[PDB]
Amino acid sequence: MNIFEMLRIDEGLRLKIYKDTEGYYTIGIGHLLTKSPSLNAAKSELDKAIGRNCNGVITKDEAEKLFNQDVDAAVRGILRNAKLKPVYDSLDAVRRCAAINMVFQMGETGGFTNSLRMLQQKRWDEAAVNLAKSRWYNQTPNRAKRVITTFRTGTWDAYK
Numbered sequence: 001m002n003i004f005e006m007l008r009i010d011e012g013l014r015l016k017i018y019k020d021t022e023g024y025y026t027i028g029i030g031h032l033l034t035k036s037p038s039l040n041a042a043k044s045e046l047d048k049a050i051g052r053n054c055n056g057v058i059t060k061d062e063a064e065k066l067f068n069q070d071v072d073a074a075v076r077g078i079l080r081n082a083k084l085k086p087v088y089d090s091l092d093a094v095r096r097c098a099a100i101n102m103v104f105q106m107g108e109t110g111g112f113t114n115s116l117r118m119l120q121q122k123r124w125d126e127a128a129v130n131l132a133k134s135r136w137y138n139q140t141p142n143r144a145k146r147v148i149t150t151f152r153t154g155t156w157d158a159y160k
């Protein structure tokens with residue numbers, strides 16, 4: 001298991017524009033296209049992202065390339081953020097995947113100051129409790145539980 005397998009499980013794969021859990025136009029392996037309610041706006045974002053006129057549909061290869069880019073962008077958002085980088089560097093490799101997963105889902109900016117401190121301190125049970133007191137956990141509880149279990153245990157048990 002690695003960050004790609006983990007997020008592929010959490011996000012699935014759809015080759016036609018769909019709506020995510022917040023109602024936002026998305027494609028591929030959880031690639032957000034736009035928060036605008038306009039499908040035409042989403043289709044324009046898609047064509048720009050892929051480099052061809054897609055008509056709202058992509059190939060598996062294109063979805064996987066977008067996914068690589070998106071995982072890379074999440075890692076970079078961590079490494080460029082003065083609050084996130086020190087915590088990320090303090091984690092082992094499995095827990096680093098949980099961190100990337102959260103940034104992929106909610107963005108580098110997207111209130112976890114106290115959870116970050118507990119993670120840096122390696123207070124895993126306390127961090128797990130604090131992470132669940134969130135809109136994130138309430139709105140996507142099964143995915144949040146898998147990510148939190150990864151932070152709590154440092155194992156892939158929730159995914160296996």
Ligand SMILES: C=CCCc1ccccc1
Binds near residue numbers: 085102112
């Ligand atoms: C768990 C809170 C936010 C995700 C994260 C965690 C640790 C390091 C970087 C990002």
